[PDB]
């Protein structure tokens, strides 16, 4: 989540005074080249390096990835609501997530580098196979980075992290 190890260099700048989504590139700053859904969306030659996705009210979404002098980094699936990606469904106040890769092993979930969906002592957070259920989803509390991984593997080894921002 917070870590970029695993080529997860794309993270969201949550230091915005206005409801704008700024994306940051953790590459050797020489020139950051930004891509969106595989297609390049920008090339920052020195100076600025953050990518503005616009206001969060426009629900920015897509698999965003950058590149400095090295090869492309792992994508960051942005999903605002104000390679197979993670599936997001909203029904009233319930947020349900579907793991993109569910080979049938025990799928574990982590929220801002914090495991979730494991304990049954939480009525509003359920894990059903490749489906993680978040009832009464808290915009200010339950938004952030999310990742799914099988038992035995490292979350940083996941193909990409998901950045969730939803107003319910």
């Amino acid at each position, epitope marked *: 989540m917070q870590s970029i190890k695993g080529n997860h260099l794309v993270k969201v700048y949550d230091y915005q005074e206005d409801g704008s989504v700024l994306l940051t590139c953790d590459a050797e700053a020489k020139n950051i080249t930004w891509f969106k859904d595989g297609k390049m969306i920008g090339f920052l030659t020195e100076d600025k390096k953050k990518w503005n996705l616009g206001s969060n009210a426009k629900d920015p979404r897509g698999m965003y990835q950058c590149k400095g002098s090295q090869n492309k980094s792992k994508p960051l699936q942005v999903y605002y609501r104000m390679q197979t990606p993670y599936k997001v469904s909203i029904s009233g106040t319930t947020v349900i997530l579907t793991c993109p890769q569910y080979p049938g092993s025990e799928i574990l979930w982590q929220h801002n580098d914090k495991n979730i969906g494991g304990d049954e002592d939480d009525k509003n957070i359920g894990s059903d196979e490749d489906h993680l259920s978040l009832k009464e989803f808290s915009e200010l509390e339950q938004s952030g980075y999310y990742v799914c991984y099988p038992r*035995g593997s*490292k979350p940083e080894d996941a193909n990409f992290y998901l950045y969730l921002r939803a107003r319910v």
Partner: single-chain antibody
Framework: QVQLVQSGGGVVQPGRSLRLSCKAS????????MHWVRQAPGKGLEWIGY????????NYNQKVKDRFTISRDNSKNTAFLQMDSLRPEDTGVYFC????????????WGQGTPVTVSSAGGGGSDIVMTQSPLSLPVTPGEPASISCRSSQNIVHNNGITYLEWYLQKPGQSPQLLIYKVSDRFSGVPDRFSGSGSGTDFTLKISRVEAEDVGVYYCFQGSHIPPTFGQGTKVEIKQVQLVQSGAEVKKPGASVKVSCKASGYTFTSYWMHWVRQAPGQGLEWMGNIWPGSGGTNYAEKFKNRVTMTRDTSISTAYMELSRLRSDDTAVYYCARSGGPYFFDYWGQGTLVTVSSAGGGGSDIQMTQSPSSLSASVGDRVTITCSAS?????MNWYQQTPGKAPKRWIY???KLASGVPSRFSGSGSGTDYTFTISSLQPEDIATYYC?????????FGQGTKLQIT
């Protein structure tokens, strides 16, 4: 002290079903995943799978994915391992282990339970109905004679030698031919005859036409389990019970092949349901007196088949759950008779079930050397090579007669109580285990294990001895 207790092992005949229990103590049973590992005599550690007690989510090794069912009871802190259709290959010590996800390792291992899969009495289990000729081809109009010998005396307490020789024409349901050892089925032309006594019996076909062509299969009768013999395929040198339609299911699944019945009171003739493996003979599977729902299951499937019936709709269902690769057979559903078993038969419902690669790569670990003798104080280095990059490697110590013990975790971290003279190193597909100073107490077998992907793969084990 965390404790894993394996129970339920023992000796069972091949093909039987076995249920094991692993009681967990010293920790919250639901917070760590439970895995079962089998240690066969002379082989290294084999991962079978895991089940999450908090979620009930289970994963299995493909080699047993279709015959074993992993169960657990959170109320009893016990995990249940239901093993069915056991083969001699399943013989060995079965171990249960606790997975600490934090170290990505099985840190607690149970002492294991020995399982031995061998038949106490094959003849008692199945009165071997060997038939003398096999696929004898016969020119038309010839005095054919097919002999079969029963591994024991087929002479029942009633004294009737309840024998037959039921014929299945190519692509057709089995039909009975000789009502008992030498009588004739109504409608069976007298051209067929037969004779026998004690354990040796034989059938005579004085005149042979195109009609006689097919396989004649000798079923036994005095022994409790009907048991069909090898089968002599003769070659050249109303009440109708409708079966259901051909189905293909996937390994571990279940098929309910139906059997609709008309022309007889369905609850007045026991609807025993034979099975005919491709490339193998018939084997009685179970019966059900449609009147009362009684089941008399056969031993080979004793914990996998379930035969129910709806006398209402005059159809008999038979749901074979946890289907396995060799289960593919056509469940000819016959109506078990008065003086002749398996009288009139249904169309037959073939059910071919097949599996895919199921992680065939099963990315392998190779350990070297397989056995090592070194002097006390000598430096011993053990290498473990992975067929693919594994993120972390673990080292486990198994003293002969003792369960594997976690020794090195995260490819360099020594388990609690592990002396510092042991050291693990490596990355990707190469790992090394180094014992800086050999001690006599270090005599044991060392196995390397990868967890990057299911199933957990273990190195063959390095036998360390002191010269």
């Amino acid at each position: 002290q965390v404790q894993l207790v394996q129970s339920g092992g023992g000796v069972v005949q091949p093909g039987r079903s076995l249920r094991l229990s692993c009681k967990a103590s010293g920790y919250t049973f639901t917070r760590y995943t439970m895995h079962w590992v089998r240690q066969a005599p002379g082989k290294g550690l084999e991962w079978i799978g895991y089940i999450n007690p908090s979620r009930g989510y289970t994963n299995y090794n493909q080699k047993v994915k279709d015959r074993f069912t992993i169960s657990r009871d959170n109320s009893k802190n016990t995990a249940f391992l239901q093993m069915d259709s056991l083969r001699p290959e399943d013989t060995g010590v079965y171990f249960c282990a606790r997975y600490y996800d934090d170290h990505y390792s099985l840190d607690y291992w149970g002492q294991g339970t020995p399982v031995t899969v061998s038949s106490a009495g094959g003849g008692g289990s199945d009165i071997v109905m060997t038939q003398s000729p096999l696929s004898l081809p016969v020119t038309p109009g010839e005095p054919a004679s097919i002999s079969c010998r029963s591994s024991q005396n087929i002479v029942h307490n009633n004294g009737i030698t309840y024998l037959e020789w039921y014929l299945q024409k190519p692509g057709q349901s089995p039909q009975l031919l000789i009502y008992k050892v030498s009588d004739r089925f109504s409608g069976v032309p007298d051209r067929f005859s037969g004779s026998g006594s004690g354990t040796d019996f034989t059938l005579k076909i004085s005149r042979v036409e195109a009609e006689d062509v097919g396989v004649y299969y000798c079923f036994q009768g005095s022994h409790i389990p009907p048991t069909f013999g090898q089968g002599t395929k003769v070659e050249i040198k109303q009440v109708q019970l409708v079966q259901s339609g051909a189905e293909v299911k996937k390994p571990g699944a279940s098929v309910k092949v139906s059997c609709k019945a008309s022309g007889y009171t369905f609850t007045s003739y026991w609807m025993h349901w034979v099975r005919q493996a491709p490339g193998q003979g018939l084997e009685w599977m179970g019966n059900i007196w449609p009147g009362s729902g009684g089941t008399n299951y056969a031993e080979k499937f004793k914990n996998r088949v379930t035969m129910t019936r709806d006398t209402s709709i005059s159809t008999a269902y038979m749901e074979l759950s946890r289907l396995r690769s060799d289960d593919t057979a056509v469940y000819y559903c016959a109506r078990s008779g008065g003086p002749y078993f398996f009288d009139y038969w249904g169309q037959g419902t073939l059910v071919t079930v097949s599996s895919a690669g199921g992680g065939g790569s099963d990315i392998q670990m190779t350990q070297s050397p397989s056995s090592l003798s070194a002097s006390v104080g000598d430096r011993v280095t053990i290498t473990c090579s992975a067929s693919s990059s594994v993120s972390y490697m673990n080292w486990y110590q198994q003293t002969p007669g003792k369960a594997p013990k976690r020794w090195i975790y995260d490819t360099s971290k020594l388990a609690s109580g592990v002396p510092s003279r042991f050291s693990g190193s490596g990355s990707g597909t190469d790992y090394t285990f180094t014992i800086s100073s050999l001690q006599p107490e270090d005599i044991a077998t060392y196995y390397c294990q990868q967890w990057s992907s299911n199933p957990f793969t273990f190195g063959q084990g390095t036998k360390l001895q002191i010269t």
